[PDB]
């Protein structure tokens, strides 16, 4: 059950209540099947940005020192 908040929002559970009968309540679940396939596809069209923006490359030879954390043994 992925895209929980998206599905709960499409069903209207943030403003109203589902029908108390299983026939219509289940049809409302299958009605968002198209929209989930759409919103998931849109989220996979993001363009790239430099990885070296908020993160130093850990493969850089500068980090081959394998340095330890010096501590105080209180």
């Amino acid at each position: 059950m992925d895209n929980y908040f998206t599905a709960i929002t499409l069903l209207g559970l943030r403003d109203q209540n589902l029908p108390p009968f299983k026939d219509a309540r289940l049809q409302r679940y299958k009605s968002i099947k198209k929209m989930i396939d759409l919103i998931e596809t849109t989220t996979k069209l993001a363009p790239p940005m430099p990885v070296e923006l908020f993160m130093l490359n850990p493969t850089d030879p500068e980090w081959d020192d394998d340095m330890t954390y010096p501590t105080i043994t209180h």
Binding site: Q16, D37, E40, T59
Partner: protein, 269 residues
């Protein structure tokens, strides 16, 4: 050179918020007393961590608090089958050695991780890409052989499988693309021009009435007389719609010695 304080310290403004989860009178009264003297009380313990001093978690009376583990039906029997149901009790009973063993990770989630390839194998990959964009692919044979030789075989298997996974995910994403970009029969010939100037709020309860009778005051002035008349009109329309009914199909799961189809279950037993 003052010690650093975490964001939580500015919500409470103290390191000694005596938070006890046990909702007994003896406990909450003692906490209020202890919460007031924490500034000059030697028997004071911190619950808000800082750069200079660690802290304790939430207290449960004299012991410590932790939420009930998320229900997990996985268990292991020792003497007899217990039929453990995590939904039959509020708090999970302790595990007795001769009765049951619960699954690992009382407080655990499902994640995906990846091993870090060896450093020398990474340097050979960096040298191949670098020589690729500079000298081209056809002049990177020596850098490719260094990879196949220096990188241990378990790493080459990982590299081999990454390509097959992303190839699988690439198709799974494009199949969703095809289902998503498909034009249904109810949208044939419709474009952005046929779209209405509406937003999300226009489909909410204030603007779009739900499919329930008591969502608003629409049917609050209806009398039994109007109902009997409405029952006659719906029955009138059924004099033309009931003429058709789907035909009964054969039961594909008639044979009990055959793997049944996971067919959609009936709404009611």
């Amino acid at each position: 050179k003052a010690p650093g304080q975490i964001y939580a310290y500015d919500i409470h403004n103290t390191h000694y918020p005596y938070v006890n989860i046990k909702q007994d009178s003896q406990t909450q009264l003692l906490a209020s007393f202890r919460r007031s003297i924490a500034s000059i009380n030697p028997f004071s313990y911190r619950q808000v961590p800082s750069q200079d001093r660690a802290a304790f978690g939430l207290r449960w009376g004299n012991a410590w608090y932790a939420p009930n583990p998320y229900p997990n039906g996985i268990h292991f029997d020792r003497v007899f089958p217990t039929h453990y149901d995590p939904l039959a009790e509020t708090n999970r009973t302790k595990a007795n050695l001769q009765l049951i063993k619960y699954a690992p990770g009382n407080y655990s989630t499902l994640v995906v991780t990846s091993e870090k390839l060896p450093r020398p194998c990474i340097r050979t990959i960096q040298n191949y890409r670098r020589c690729q964009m500079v000298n081209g692919t056809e002049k990177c044979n020596s850098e490719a052989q260094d990879i196949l030789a220096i990188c241990p075989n378990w790493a080459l298997d990982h590299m081999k499988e990454k390509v097959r996974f992303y190839t699988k995910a690439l198709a799974i994403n494009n199949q969703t693309y095809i289902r998503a970009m498909q034009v249904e029969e109810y949208n044939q010939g419709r474009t952005v021009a046929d779209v209405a100037p509406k937003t999300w709020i226009h489909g909410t309860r204030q603007h779009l009435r739900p499919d329930t009778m008591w969502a608003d005051d629409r049917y609050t002035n209806i009398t039994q007389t109007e109902i009997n008349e409405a029952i006659k009109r719906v029955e009138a329309r059924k004099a033309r719609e009931h003429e058709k009914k789907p035909v009964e199909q054969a039961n594909v799961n008639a044979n009990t010695g055959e793997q049944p189809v996971r067919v959609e279950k009936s709404l009611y037993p």
